[model samples]
Target chain A: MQIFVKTLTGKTITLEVEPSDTIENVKAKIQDKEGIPPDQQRLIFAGKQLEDGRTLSDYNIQKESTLHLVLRLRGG
Target chain B: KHTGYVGLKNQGATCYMNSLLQTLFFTNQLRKAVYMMPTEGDDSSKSVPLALQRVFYELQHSDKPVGTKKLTKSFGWETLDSFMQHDVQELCRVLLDNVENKMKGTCVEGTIPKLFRGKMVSYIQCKEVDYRSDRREDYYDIQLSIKGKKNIFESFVDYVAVEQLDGDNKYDAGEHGLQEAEKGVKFLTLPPVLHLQLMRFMYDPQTDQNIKINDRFEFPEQLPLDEFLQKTDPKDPANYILHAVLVHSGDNHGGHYVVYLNPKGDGKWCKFDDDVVSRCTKEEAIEHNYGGHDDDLSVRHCTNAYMLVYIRESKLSEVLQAVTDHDIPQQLVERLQEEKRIEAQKITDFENRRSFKCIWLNSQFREEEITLYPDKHGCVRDLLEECKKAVELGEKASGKLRLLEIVSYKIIGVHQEDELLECLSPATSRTFRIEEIPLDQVDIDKENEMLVTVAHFHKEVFGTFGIPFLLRIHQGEHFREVMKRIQSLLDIQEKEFEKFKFAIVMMGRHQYINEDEYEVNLKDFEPQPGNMSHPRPWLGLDHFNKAPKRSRYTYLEKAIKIHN
Candidate 1:
């Protein structure tokens, strides 16, 4: 499966993964490609945060599914 | 609907002053009581309440923005000297002190403190001893540091934890012979106008810098503080409604201050950004100012709320009467009810979900409890980073981090540090257990505990040492950027730039080299990493004592040594 990830800053990236792969696994891959830390990344699909244990198949995510990424840090 | 709020004009870089003035003006009890104050044998210029009375009188009559130049000049602000950038909180404290000082020996009723002040009772006792317990009380304008969590009610209930008192205490000269621990803080009496200041800015001793906590603290529109009160007096109203918020919008060094005030508790909230007074919705005010990190770090954190002003619910009629000498308008009442209804629905929906209590590893090598909703899976790495920050550890390093669960103090399972805890969802237990991952497994060693020499520049004053006049640089950091930082940090005037120069004296094994380096981009010396052999960097200076020989170092100071 393939999905398109878009950050709040308007930076977009596409990656291919298996449906069986957990959300956490996908986030680690995204963290590697993008400089954003996995913990800082908030992956949202259809206005809901992607759960860690759940597989891509659990969310019914398909190829080219758009996942919004929101990265945050505790600072002023 | 009749609107009685008056906007104040910004006198140059006096927006911080203007915003605070506007908020105080909206404070119904304070404004009305100030006017009713009996004339005392004190000069009007020396009195804050008198100046406030005049400001309010002018605000009501004048159609234009009122200027604070005359007020500032009259109030001996000149003695503080030079009108430059100042903190609103400090200005507020000074104004309040002036008011209180002038009101001494006067009637107590309808006074500023009488209307707005509340008392805090810190009760502490030793866990080991049954008979040892003590209480300390202090009056405060704000009730602060109400712990926050995923659940609002639980967060409110979790008031400041009791601190452990060590035997080597200063109070009573340790004569009481009691080992101390802070049990908790309790409110003796809830005031009519309750002010709560969130403990956001904490001083990190490790970095010697103030760090801001952008935690998600959700405050309610209507607050029932019955749970926090020591004794519930039937005469006093335990309910309070959110009235005003003082929002800070930048880092510790430089930030613009603004105020959001709802005068009548009539749903209409206005943003007073200095001279610009604009209308904002109730939802916007609540959601925007409830301090938290937004999705983007590049943008300023919007909800850096410093102080919250909540008026007692029973005193709504008094507040309305103060603003306008009549009952609140029917339309305004209807709007307020509508806002409350919407907010209630939101709260009810939030309450439907159950929160799970979980413990996570903290950077100080301890387990701290936290609450999370099932749907909202917390990031493990985020928790660790927060713990590290709390313990004053350095920022995110390139090294690999890990998370592991402790089974009888033994690692049961190891997972990537970035991985989220899957078992944390909707647990039956009161708290889920987790513990620190072994340092050796994570590849973090004692050598990795990096420390650098932080140089601060100061000069001698009248043969005595002057205050550290602006200048701080890490031994490893670039010299040019450090100089630039100092210039901006002090808000140095343009005319003073030429006077600012870096002077240094390098001390080696044998000789001394007096040198002067002037540049935008340069490093004074190479960074020496501290190790077992040398606990401190090679060029270490004992910050406490300025003895040059005791700690051999390359000393530097930036000052206005103007040469003709």
Candidate 2:
């Protein structure tokens, strides 16, 4: 299934996914697009962590969903 | 009046209609009133003429039109008409609604004291107030009267989250503008945005219905205190730096209000342009306009400060009167009793620390343990293991570290030739404070290990040194630089790296780069991520005389010789 992927600034970047794709995979693609470090890249959906090892299928992600990828910013 | 209450189950459908009627009528009288603006104008400003004209029109549509003599005698065409013309029956009806509401609930739980000093409760003080009345041309001498004694404690809800003034800018309210309300009494006009969310305490019943409450007010986007002092005009964007801090009235457990406002706030010294009075003529009337618009919103500089005004439920009730509306007869006493019971066990924990610890470390790869070493060499090794665990476990030991203290990693490059490092984040400022000489003396081999650790750590540490593409270094070469450039890293404090003996270097070729080159792995770093390679690199620190190119080949050979 395809999902809309976005960068930290809420900028839409991509729409690609596999039913088995974990939140980690989407984060990888986001890193490629926004150049955010994996450690800094925080994937969240519905206020919950798209934590590593947890596949997209484990969560409620479905076809044509929008994924949010934010780089946890620090300082002012 | 039976004190022991019984509802439908106990009363057997008797439908106590007698008391129901009285209570229903009283409940019907309970009303919330909204102040309205006068829709019609009076003569002079069309005041007297309009009043007279409306009266004349009403008289023409009167129910009884008697014979001329009787009509003249009863109406007294001049005397009675004059007396009745100015009577405001419609306004009286509006006011009657409020009076009936008050009479219906004549049993006020308690009366709070009234102290009226109008604008003082507000963040902005009002120098003058004008009450427009057709009958009188003079200004109205009105003041805000706070209706109760000061609350003993402040509120926590208002302290954590604050609303931006005017919905546009967060940076507008500077430091001087952020102040707690007098005696912790919040004006009704300003309710804490997150008050309902914090369920720690509730207001007392009698006190809840007291209408003397006020929401604590502050200039959330207050100007910075430091900037306010340094520049000629502190509001000038160039002079200001974003600052964050927490403001609370009490120690530790006192409600910690988060402030995103300017700590450098001096005062609202920016002068507004003079108001212009201009009129435009429409076909039927003239439109007048004045006053300059406020364009600056202080949100950018206001994220740092959290203002905590901690107050309890009983105190809150003294300000807002509607908090004690117990209309359901069966539940009224019980709910109040429960609240009272909860209040009896009141306790406040104020011994907690306010400042958060900030640790700057190389949380690039996955690691198992989060350990801090006094010596720089070992810190890199610990940080590397931390990063490795992050890659494997996809998380860092955030709970183990304190947030208030900052930890920075000494890094190096290790990787594939194509591997690139990208400087990430909008870097405010990045300069390494290097100390090549160990803080404490150690053997040269162990010292060499420390250097290796520092070299390896530098990759994760200084990768985010500058803006994207601004600073880049090869894995081996950067490690060498960590040792030689120790002086520059220390902001070039002294000619030599002192108190710091070794540099940390990662074991690999083409390892380090800007954060833009490498992917940020955040499993090891929380609320933030670190720049690291796909297959994390090993740390190495070599002497200044050793060639980085030679060391790269040596480490590669070492990797091949070792059994995985």
Candidate 3:
């Protein structure tokens, strides 16, 4: 399976992954590719904040589903 | 039939702003209070009160679409900010916060809270003991829950809806702790001007975002909120009249905004779409904006009332009372006028830069700008005619002033200069050097000349029809000649030019050039008022008759928009 990640600046990247993987596993992959720490990453899919413990299947994030990568702002 | 409602410019996505602003402006009491916001020792650029006062004044006095650029600027927002489509509730809060900050220690120090702030009390009561705890708080607006709710009253009921604190969530009654209790909130009192933010945007775990609830929700024209107020004064009643409805006509994240307003509290409503003002029926005002299952071809219904404003019936006279000329402050009058003059100076400066090219001459060291037309500036023959004015020499031996063009060199590192020149918006006055020679010192066939052209387009609106009777003119063509051309072109009636007003609409700043002014052969694209960030600049001619100048637009004559 594959999913799409997008930045607020309109930059999009595709990642090869499985729906069984937890949200944390996806963040680690982004960290490996983009060098952004997982703690700093706040992933949003259709406006829902993806929890680290939740699987992509739990969020119904299928192949080609786009998720927004945001800074974990203390207060924005 | 006789009302004075003016429309606001949308500024791309500022229809939300228009709705909210119109509501505030129509709240006569708020307008009166806003005028009282001190203008002394403050900058309107950073002052919401001052900016709001200015906006209110223009809406009252101007027949044309009033702008909110300055007001938004005062919010510390850039031109690109409002297009972000911020929620109206957040926008209103930020506005009020800015206004509140501006009013600190001023005459209207506590004014906004007086008009908008309502009171609520949250309590915890022990079932067995005589122990009870309650906390009171103030609120600027109420967020009424809409899911599974049928009416405003149902939402209101859910707002103060109680929670059982029996088993695990027990009340800690001071000494006798961990007792069975009931906890909830109750409205102590509603404000004079009550703001209710309808929770049409509900957070759905399914979609993960706040989704729009298109379920039918009813709000009455006359909401009997007396029952909602847990405690009330007999003399000062709580029955509220519906004054305004701020509607959102799209999905949860972003959409269009328009507000229907009953300006007089007499049940007369108006629709204020951007740049167009018109009247509406009660059905159009209240019913059409009701976003739910309807007798129409549409996707899932999204347009609905997101924010509502109600004024207490007892305070109706005071709330909607006449905000007469006597109410506007002199301090703001001077501040706004002086600011406008300064604004004109900016446009005029840029306009002059765009139209004229400053030349460094061989004989004439005193630099002079050769006036050039938009399209004809490239023609050497026409350029020579205009260049003739700058030189003291006659057309014989000296009139043939040779020109040499200069490309980007100094001012920054020499390399980026060429790079910068290529990408410059040709209309945005980016000048190159031109060396001038007189008295046959320079040749017509050999010397270099940078083709100087300024962007110019004229649009004339013949009354409401907005027919663009375009016209063109030569060098130094003044008002009379321009008027004559328009007279012949549009076949003007006698004394009709008296009403003809030309706008110096350069750089998105609008200034009127009247019939009395002359020798102003300067015209280009004039931006429509309130529209900032105009990528294109031009001079525009508009039919200008100010808002009668007798009194404010006769009251309750506001153009309202129903965002269906």
Candidate 4:
């Protein structure tokens, strides 16, 4: 299956994923290709922060589904 | 010629509370009532009525944005509780509940309920038999579904939309076992001040925790309740004019809250964004916060209405009546003055010190506690210097040591917006991590703050429930603490612990855990995958007592009335 990661800064990165791939596995793929660390990437799809323990199929993430790759924001 | 308009300061990420407080303050009658509270000897920091009077007094007189810690402190909320749910609806209810309790025996004893409360009737009218059941209930604020609605009017229609208890979903009438019925709610009385919460944040079974619906839902400047009401006084009009608009705008899940208040029913409006107050146009006030997908790629922020305050057009003269200093109790005024004097004179012993935990980001894998001078002196620059001496070669990482703060176990924002100093007094911390990595390894956006959400769900209670409020599970905290936190949060009675069962609400769904070790930390318990993950995992509990199921019906359709 194929999926995409879009950012708030108006950038999009496409990825080839599998239904069985855990959200962590998907973030690792994002890290591998984009040099964006897995920890920095917060993958949001269909209105949720895709927890790494769950798989693409678990969240019903299908082909052509674009997951928002928002940067994890922090404050003091 | 300073008009002296002041906004509420944001404590941590408490924009939601500030917005609600501002809206509540602008409701002139409520403000007057807060003044009228007999706060004579109840000068303690914990007194809601007294503390709130001080807050309103500061907002009226102070040139600076008012700090809201006193108000939260009055509610017995510590700094940790501040990091919990940012639901405005819940905060408003809690505030009103406290105010109502404080108003007892006073002239304004029933002022809040009378201003914000309304009644509705819930009914189940049988189709095959002459059987019907109805119940009347009162509400302070009404929550309207926005999943498929185009406007507030549409959502209200959906609110009163009938449910057919036919086919597989038949209502079990006592005498006639299973029967067909039409069930819905009808409004009985409309309050003078209506608080309408947009059902923007809600649960989705497929997804986890709370999900926001950024659907475009429009509200009018004047809302006429006559059409929707089952009954209304012919003399007293049901038309309500928009008074305040509370907004949540964080395009990426976590949004900052701001409110546009029309303090006076006159068209004039002002947008209050955490201490910054400025006049705004009707278009900027209404259209901007509508929260719809923007076609223009230039505009990045996703904005939307979280809650709204409207005043009845007929009662506008009384509700929005101008409140003056004369209306304020003298004790409340004198107490604030005396407190300010003491703070200025005897300032040494009373410290504005806040404790913060510092976790190193580089190969300097270390974590420890640091003290922050929240008295405007401890911003990013000084904070870096203070944290600099703590770590080995922490000085070498000096210029690069940028501080990152976490809320709900996720990195919410960086301090470089030249922030924190303003909210620094109320701006304390849980754990503030700093990064001063070597060039190739440097990334300030790495730290994550998150809170695990536990929902109360009982299988025995007809269907399960994700209670209106969400509870947070902090990492490394003992499971016992989590248990007690939920016990108090979910309002579980003393020994209801015997009937309660805990489970992880994950993809596998309801993975019940062993309660053997109450001292275990959730940090290790969280499922970590090969790569990075934000472990805000959902939790579920099967406990006794049915969750109050009131949204289903409302006042005119009671059990006895249908027989007539």
Per-residue C-alpha lDDT of model 1 across residues B83-177, encoded as one tens digit per residue: 36555655665576567656676654526666655665545455555544344433435424423454235544554444444443211213444
lDDT by residue for model 3 over B465-518, one digit each (tens)?
222222344445456876675566455466655655566544445566666666
Q: Write the per-residue lDDT of candidate 4 for residues B1-564, one digit (tens) a residue.
A: 022366876667777778777887887888888887877778466688888888889987766668888877988888897665355655565567767867888888888778877777766689999987765656676666667778889878876777565564455575786667776678998889887767664344575434566767899877978878987678876888888888776532465777898777788888888766888899888877776766674333456777788888888899878877888777778888987987764325533455554566543332445554444423566667665566555444434566665543334335673454444323444446676634322432223324444446676322345432234445445577767766665454676776888776544445677666664445543555752344435566777654455575655665665565
Deviation from native of the Cα of residue A30 in model 1, angstroms: 46
RMSD of each: 34.7, 33.9, 20.9, 32.2
* Number of the candidate with higher lDDT, 1 or 3: 3
- Residue B402: error of model 4 in Å? 32
- Name the weakest run of 10 consecutive residues (lDDT summed) in model 4 chain B: B440-449
Q: Local distance difference test, per candidate?
A: 0.53, 0.26, 0.62, 0.66
What DockQ, on C-alphas, does every prediction get? Answer: 0.01, 0.01, 0.02, 0.01
What tens digits encode model 1's per-residue C-alpha lDDT throughout A1-76? 5455643333335566789999889999887776555654656553235667899998777654556564321211
TM-score of every candidate relative to the true structure: 0.47, 0.18, 0.54, 0.54
Tens digits of per-residue lDDT, candidate 2, B485-551, equal 4333334245324433332122334333242223223221111135444323333322122123443
| Model 1, runs deviating above 4 Å | A1-76, B1-4, B38-47, B79-82, B107-110, B146-156, B166-182, B204-207, B233-237, B297-299, B323-564
Cα displacement (Å) at residue B298, model 1? 4.8
Q: Please report the candidate that would top DockQ against the real structure.
A: 3
